[PDB]
Amino acid sequence: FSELLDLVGGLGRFQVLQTMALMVSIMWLCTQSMLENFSAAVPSHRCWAPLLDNSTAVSTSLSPEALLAISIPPGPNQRPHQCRRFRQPQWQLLDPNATATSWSEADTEPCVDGWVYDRSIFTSTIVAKWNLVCDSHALKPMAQSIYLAGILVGAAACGPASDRFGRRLVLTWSYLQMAVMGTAAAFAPAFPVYCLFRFLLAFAVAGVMMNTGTLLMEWTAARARPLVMTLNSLGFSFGHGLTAAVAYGVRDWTLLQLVVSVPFFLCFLYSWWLPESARWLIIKGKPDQALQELRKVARINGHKEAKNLTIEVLMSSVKEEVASAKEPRSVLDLFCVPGLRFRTCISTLCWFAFGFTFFGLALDLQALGSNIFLLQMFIGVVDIPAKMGALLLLSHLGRRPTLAASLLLAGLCILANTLVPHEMGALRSALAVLGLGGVGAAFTCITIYSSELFPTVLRMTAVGLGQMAARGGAILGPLVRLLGVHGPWLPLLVYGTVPVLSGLAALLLPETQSL
Ligand SMILES: *[C@@H]1O[C@H](CO)[C@@H](O)[C@H](O)[C@H]1NC(C)=O
Ligand SMILES: O=C(O)c1cnccn1
Structure with a gap:
């Protein structure tokens, strides 16, 4: 194949613009995966209790720490218990002469009135929205596992689809599905629905990952191939910094998920100006279309010499790629x-x-x-x-x-x-x-x-x-x-x-x- 790339420009202006445009998408894609460090952060929490949280009640001379000691029992970490509260206020526990033997487990109950969360670091997170705490604590890693299972299932489906419909086409609709499903996940009304939309987002993340690399390889001359794969790998590196940067400013999970989803509408739009892989087009028996893609890239690079190309040249020089069907x-x-x-x-x-x-x-x-x-x-x-x-x-x-x-x-x-x-x-x-x-x-x-x-x-x-x-x-x-x-x-x-x-x-x- 390489002779065609050398005639069209194997590492020209086009490959530079393409590598940049694809790396930027990989950065945002990395933020989508890393998001649930922040979108699903666990703020410190306790039960709701009358003496602490009934804003309509009469005030007292006691300090917040006194009321807190009176109302929520201590947990192992020298801090309030995250899942229990006293059935009746323990006025007897206010004095420093009191002992832990003064009360019994029967004097405690779970958070009948629900939880109260620390809003000082994050204004909202899915954990606070659907109370994924205490007996429900397992649901956070379950959500993360469902997303990653989406990546596995999407990668399984990507192979057949990419081979049958084309590298760029599957990349295009993967960008659109990421945009739509991320936007939907930002506004999910219930936790099962959030899990479903995160799964369907991951299903598309797999497609973007696979076809970005593939479509870089099939347009890059062999001398530059290791470097382009290395740049693809640096995309994720910068994605981590970008996740920290975006999540530091946007402290609300709905807006955060939306903000990291919206870019993929732009990725979807500019993926229509990328050319479809010339190897795939010739292997699937469409050299007349592959010729148009090759001359398009040549126009970008400036190689007027592409006037030499014909479907006969393509079919003569790419037969060795077509022969892969034998094995x-x-x-x-x-x-x-x-x-x-x-x-x-x-x-x-x-x-x-x-x-x-x-x-x-x-x-x-x-x-x-x-x-x-x-x-x-x-x-x-x-x-x-x-x-x-x-x-x-x-x-x-x-x-x-x-x-x-x-x-x-x-x-x-x-x-x-x-x-x-x-x-x-x-x-x-x-x-x-x-x-x-x-x-x-x-x-x-x-x-x-x-x-x-x-x-x-x-x-x-x-x-x-x-x-x-x-x-x-x-x-x-x-x-x-x-x-x-x-x-x-x-x-x-x-x-x-x-x-x-x-x-x-x-x-x-x-x-x-x-x-
Ligand atoms: C809150 O305090 C008011 C004080 O009048 C009381 O009427 C109300 O029942 C209290 N509600 C709860 C849930 O403690
Ligand atoms: O994918 C990455 O950029 C990565 C991998 N391992 C550790 C840290 N970052």
């Missing part, structure tokens, strides 16, 4: 061939570990430190040098030790985050950020390494199995957070163990750098 393959082939079974297991486990760990940790920054805006910013700022350093080390040291050391760095940081005492918020934040940076670097490594462990006809199938394994592990990510009932050490121990085990396994792969 089908399937996922089971990876496991049948005796030499490829072991590589497949270890590679898939590494993809899984990326997805599981990242979407386990990066969606509860409120547990990792005291300021989630700075945490959300720093997991971008540190992620940039992590990705770039991965590309350096993966060239100097080979694939195997870079992948292994990246995953081991991640796992040992996340595990150390169980031992550092909760008083030391700064050090805990630092270890969390570095642990996430290691996982990003591991993503870079395993993306490249999985493209080399396999023979050329099974390369695509192996990378596909890997990507679906990562998407599948992300589903289990949030659900492991429910183990926090036994103390926050346990979710962190699990999220820390998985990358250590997969990193150790990665040492058993064969090295693939040219030696």
Whole structure:
């Protein structure tokens, strides 16, 4: 194919404008995923109680702390209980000479009159809107899991649709569906409906992710291909900073979700000016249309020499791409061939570990430190040098030790985050950020390494199995957070163990750098 790109301009003005226009969309797409650090933040809460919250009642000489001690019992964290209140005011508990033995569990009841939430950091969140607290606490990670399951299902459906209807067309309607479903999620009347619209938004997020990369590849000359994939990966890095920036100003979840959805109407509009992939058009037997796309790009780049092109030139020079129909393959082939079974297991486990760990940790920054805006910013700022350093080390040291050391760095940081005492918020934040940076670097490594462990006809199938394994592990990510009932050490121990085990396994792969 490359001769046509070289005749049309393989890295010209068009490819520059296209890379910029697609990176910007990836930034906003990243905000959509990271949003529920803020859209679903848990403000501190207690039961509603007459002496505290009945604004029409007669006043008293008591201070707020006195009334609070009189009305809500203490919880383990030296703070008011989040799910109980006293059945009758405990006037006897006001004196400092009182004892915890002065009252019994029968003197307490759950929040019959509902909850009261701290509005000082966020004006509203879904947790406050639908009372996803106490007995209902599981519903937040369930919502996150449903979104990530949407990404898995959407990626499964994207393949057939992208091959049958075209790269740009599926990208276009994915942008529109993201806009519409995000806007609808911002105004959902009930929690089940919010879950449904987040699922249908994720279904489109998968399409944007897949077709952005594909449509960059099929218009980029091979000399520039690694760089363009790297820029695609930096899109998410800047997306984290953008999430912090937008969420710092917009403290209301409805307006926040709306603000991050509205851009995709603009993405939808300008996706009509992109050209459809010329490889796909010729492979599907439409060289007369592919000729128009090629001359369109040439017009943008300025290559008047495109006057040389004809459908005969295209059909003569792209037959080698058309010939790919000869050799089908399937996922089971990876496991049948005796030499490829072991590589497949270890590679898939590494993809899984990326997805599981990242979407386990990066969606509860409120547990990792005291300021989630700075945490959300720093997991971008540190992620940039992590990705770039991965590309350096993966060239100097080979694939195997870079992948292994990246995953081991991640796992040992996340595990150390169980031992550092909760008083030391700064050090805990630092270890969390570095642990996430290691996982990003591991993503870079395993993306490249999985493209080399396999023979050329099974390369695509192996990378596909890997990507679906990562998407599948992300589903289990949030659900492991429910183990926090036994103390926050346990979710962190699990999220820390998985990358250590997969990193150790990665040492058993064969090295693939040219030696
Ligand atoms: C609130 O206080 C007023 C005071 O007159 C009282 O009539 C009303 O029943 C109280 N309501 C609750 C829910 O405490
Ligand atoms: O996708 C990203 O930009 C990323 C990945 N791992 C850690 C932090 N950021």
